[PDB]
Amino acid sequence: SGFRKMAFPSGKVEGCMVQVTCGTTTLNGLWLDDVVYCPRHVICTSEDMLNPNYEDLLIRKSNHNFLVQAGNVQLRVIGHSMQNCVLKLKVDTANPKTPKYKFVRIQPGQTFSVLACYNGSPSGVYQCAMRPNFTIKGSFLNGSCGSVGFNIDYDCVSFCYMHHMELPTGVHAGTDLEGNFYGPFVDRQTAQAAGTDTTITVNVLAWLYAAVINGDRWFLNRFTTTLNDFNLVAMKYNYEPLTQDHVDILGPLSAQTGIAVLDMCASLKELLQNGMNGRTILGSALLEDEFTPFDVVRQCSGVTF
Amino acid sequence: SGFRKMAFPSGKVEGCMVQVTCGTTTLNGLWLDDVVYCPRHVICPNYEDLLIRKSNHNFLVQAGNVQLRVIGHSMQNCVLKLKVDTANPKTPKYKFVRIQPGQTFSVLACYNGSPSGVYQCAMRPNFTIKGSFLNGSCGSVGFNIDYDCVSFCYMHHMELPTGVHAGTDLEGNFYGPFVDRQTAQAAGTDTTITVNVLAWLYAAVINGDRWFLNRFTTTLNDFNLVAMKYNYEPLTQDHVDILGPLSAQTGIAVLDMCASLKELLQNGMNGRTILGSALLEDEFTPFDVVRQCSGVTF
Numbered sequence A: 001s002g003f004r005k006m007a008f009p010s011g012k013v014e015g016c017m018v019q020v021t022c023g024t025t026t027l028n029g030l031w032l033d034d035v036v037y038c039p040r041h042v043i044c045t046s047e048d049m050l051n052p053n054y055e056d057l058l059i060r061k062s063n064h065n066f067l068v069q070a071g072n073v074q075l076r077v078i079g080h081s082m083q084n085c086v087l088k089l090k091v092d093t094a095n096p097k098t099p100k101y102k103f104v105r106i107q108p109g110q111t112f113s114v115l116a117c118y119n120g121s122p123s124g125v126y127q128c129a130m131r132p133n134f135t136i137k138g139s140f141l142n143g144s145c146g147s148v149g150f151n152i153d154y155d156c157v158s159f160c161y162m163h164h165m166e167l168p169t170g171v172h173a174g175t176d177l178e179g180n181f182y183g184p185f186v187d188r189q190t191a192q193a194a195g196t197d198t199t200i201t202v203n204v205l206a207w208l209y210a211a212v213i214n215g216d217r218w219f220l221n222r223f224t225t226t227l228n229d230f231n232l233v234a235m236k237y238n239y240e241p242l243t244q245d246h247v248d249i250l251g252p253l254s255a256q257t258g259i260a261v262l263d264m265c266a267s268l269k270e271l272l273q274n275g276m277n278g279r280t281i282l283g284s285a286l287l288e289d290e291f292t293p294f295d296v297v298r299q300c301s302g303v304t305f
Numbered sequence B: 001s002g003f004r005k006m007a008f009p010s011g012k013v014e015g016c017m018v019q020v021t022c023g024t025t026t027l028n029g030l031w032l033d034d035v036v037y038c039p040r041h042v043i044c045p046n047y048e049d050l051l052i053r054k055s056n057h058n059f060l061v062q063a064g065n066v067q068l069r070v071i072g073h074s075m076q077n078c079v080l081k082l083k084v085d086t087a088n089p090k091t092p093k094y095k096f097v098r099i100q101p102g103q104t105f106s107v108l109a110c111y112n113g114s115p116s117g118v119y120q121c122a123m124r125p126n127f128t129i130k131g132s133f134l135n136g137s138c139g140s141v142g143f144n145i146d147y148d149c150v151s152f153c154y155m156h157h158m159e160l161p162t163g164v165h166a167g168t169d170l171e172g173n174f175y176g177p178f179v180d181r182q183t184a185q186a187a188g189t190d191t192t193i194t195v196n197v198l199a200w201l202y203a204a205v206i207n208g209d210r211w212f213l214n215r216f217t218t219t220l221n222d223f224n225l226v227a228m229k230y231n232y233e234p235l236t237q238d239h240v241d242i243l244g245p246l247s248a249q250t251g252i253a254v255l256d257m258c259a260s261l262k263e264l265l266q267n268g269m270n271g272r273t274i275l276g277s278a279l280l281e282d283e284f285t286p287f288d289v290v291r292q293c294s295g296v297t298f
Ligand SMILES: CNC(=O)CN1C[C@@H](C(=O)Nc2cncc3ccc(F)cc23)c2cc(Cl)ccc2C1=O
Pocket: A041, A049, A140, A141, A142, A143, A144, A145, A164, A165, A166, A167, A168, A172, A186, A187, A188, A189, A190, B001
């Protein structure tokens, strides 16, 4: 019993965090095998950030301009290349702590753990989701750039995010580990703003099934809905449209609890209409959208209470 | 910017988790130096009588894919200490510390000696923790990190009928009036950790959420009468002193913030949120707020 926002154990990622310094800028790097991955904006000054020509800044650099520190040990940079918005520093030592890993690009609604780091040293771990507007609502201060997002299903670490910047509203933007940004963002200090955000509907439904599993049914009703009528209502509350893929994905949780997806969709419509009336669902007075159907199945029991 | 429920990096604890099996029971153990610590209920009660029957080879300890040989066993309160023939090469610098209600810690949830997740939680005033644990999680541990030293403060033992959890410090002393046996046990009426809600209100102000601030101030006496009415823990002068730095950083005196909290308790949030929450959050200590709004590393 219980339901917490749970992050993956961070040990396999801690053993990869390094500090990367180029001139006056210091940020975090990810050391896997003999390569250190970091945001390419480590080569920029704050002045350069408005309209930086990264190719022009990079050509002026040599290997010895990049200082890489792993713990109390200086790593020697023997090569460098840029791939999209990520800088790849070839080092002369393979990381003995390199876990089994993959680089995966995630879609909005997907969750991951973030190991927040400063000066190559990990300070904390939290769980979050890629918002529909491609931003993440993280907790990052200056010096956190290069901190990474990941999932660990089995013994393999799947790296999905690298932190690059904070937008004016306090939300965060970054790239996959191949340096492609999530969202229409650029690694420039130009006027950029997160688009209007929406609620991840398939995740709220999954979290309503988690409440049923843990023994709570106060929010259910005797109604059903068509998928189209559900979407016509939910879009009026800034909820993402629910697709047939989402309905298919919720199939296992529907079979475990005995509640059809479109019947759970009807409880959701009523919750949006009425509010909670002083009640909570899994200790929350808001509808939670940062748990995927996969997270609910992973954390919850196989036997409904 | 941003404010998340953040746990300490779990790597130093992951390197200590082992699987302990005795008969049909399998649970988690903490391997530090040449000793494995685990709940004594792995032998299940008259624990001294059940333990005397057991021999070293009855305890099967597995660290990864390696079997550890048990060479001795002893009981300390509700914790079993299994002497093994190999010191854990991954043993971090550590201490065993007992925490007080209101203090927070990270939990590394484990199954079959394998860590599955890490979350942050608080020791409730009724000594239970609102964790997320399934069957097989017994022996999972709670900890904090100060500099490079891991302070182990909790070991999981059981789930109560309301779905909340009970356990011991690493010396086997239970937190709360609980016993390690399947008997009629219930968590007492819980209260809200007032000093923690105040710290989280200061964190909201630091992050630009100021709608709840008002021109009023109050007294400890007046505020404590309000806190007692709303099932909030009493606020002591020690709590006020502890909130001193956050009060100096934001310019809001602790009794000035108490008047905001009093107004929130008597009138609610009015459709508004604070740090993305429609409830008053009490699982961040004043130290957690200062650490997360400063970026302290380990
Ligand atoms: C809020 N940002 C700024 O005032 C200056 N700024 C620096 C840098 C940037 O955002 N770093 C930060 C990252 N994450 C959390 C941050 C919290 C606070 C903070 F001051 C800086 C953070 C940056 C990188 C890129 Cl690729 C593009 C633009 C910028 C940029 O605008």
